[PDB]
């Protein structure tokens, strides 16, 4: 009565993606090649997709070589190519460099990023002024004009299950799995499933490990021991965050709601209090020593085979 009205809108936006892939599936449209190695990392469908997550524990893989990520940077207040990390030391400010890749950043403190929508542009900017190794697309599934040596493709259950944009989430329809190098296979901590393709695929759980402070590092969830919490979000994580609290059996006194766009100008904290929040909204907080994050960590099963098709694209 509503949702169906969508479905013409997805019919004929199917037609243009399927277009556009074609084109590139026979050869049409020119793949740009960097003279380094490029793992992207990229998903299906809008929404929660554990594609930061998994960013960081594949950065972390990588830790013995120069790493760099070419984030999209969709909305900023510059434009074109910029550097918003130089291995981790963030050299813009959220609002420059749009609150993706600074989150990014932020949450990578060896790691380089730049923010450019052609990420074979961002690439070459990085090459003359990072001499990065290897370059991670973070979201870079659709960004066919860069080749890439390893193509990650994140699916949770319900992607399978799924509509193309606007009926539903999918950005994609799902025939295009095949384009995928290996899968993994996401959110197995609340919905677990399997999905095989022949592709190599990787199980990923994630886990709660502990809090990030206001400077983004790890910090002992010890803290929040015989203490009750102030929480607030500042978007629509509403929902999401207070089941996750709630589920972690973590005592909060309190909840508060924020405008999704809310760039806490007005947020006054009380000294002496512990807050808990999102990572997303934490960036715009530092320095408030008494606000936090949760911090989760991902656990992949199969990790030895990951690590050993990331070593063969250093040849």
Not at 7 to 22: A, D, H, Q, V, W
Not at 111 to 131: H, N
Not at 190 to 217: A, H, Q
Request: proline share 4%.
């Amino acid at each position: 009565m509503l949702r169906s009205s969508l479905l013409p809108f997805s019919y004929l936006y199917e037609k243009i993606i399927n277009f556009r892939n074609t084109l590139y599936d026979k050869g049409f449209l020119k793949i740009k090649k960097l003279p380094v190695p490029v793992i992207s990392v990229g998903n299906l469908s809008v929404g929660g997709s554990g594609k930061t997550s998994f960013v960081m524990y594949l950065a972390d893989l990588l830790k013995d070589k120069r790493v760099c990520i070419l984030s999209r940077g969709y909305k900023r207040k510059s434009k074109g190519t910029l550097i918003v990390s130089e291995y981790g030391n963030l050299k813009v400010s959220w609002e420059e460099a749009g609150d993706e890749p600074y989150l990014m950043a932020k949450l990578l403190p060896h790691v380089s990023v730049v923010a450019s929508e052609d990420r074979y542009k961002g690439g070459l900017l990085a090459l003359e002024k990072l001499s990065p190794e290897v370059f991670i697309l973070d979201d870079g599934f659709q960004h066919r004009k860069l080749h890439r040596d390893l193509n990650i493709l994140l699916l949770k259950k319900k992607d399978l299950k799924d509509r193309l944009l606007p009926a539903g989430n999918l950005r994609e329809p799902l025939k295009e799995i095949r384009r995928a190098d290996a899968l993994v296979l996401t959110y197995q901590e609340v919905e677990p499933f399997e999905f095989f393709t022949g592709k190599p695929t990787f199980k990923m759980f994630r886990e709660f490990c502990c809090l990030l402070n206001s400077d983004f590092e790890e910090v002992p969830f010890d803290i929040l021991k015989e203490r009750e919490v102030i929480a607030f979000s500042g978007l629509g994580d509403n929902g999401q965050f207070r089941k996750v609290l709630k589920n972690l059996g973590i005592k909060v006194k309190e909840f508060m709601s924020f405008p999704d766009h809310y760039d806490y100008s007005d947020f006054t904290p009380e000294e002496g209090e512990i807050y808990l929040t999102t990572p997303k909204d934490l960036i715009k907080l530092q320095g408030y020593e008494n606000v936090f994050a949760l911090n989760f960590k991902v656990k992949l099963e199969r990790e030895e085979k990951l690590k050993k098709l990331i070593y063969r694209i250093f040849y």
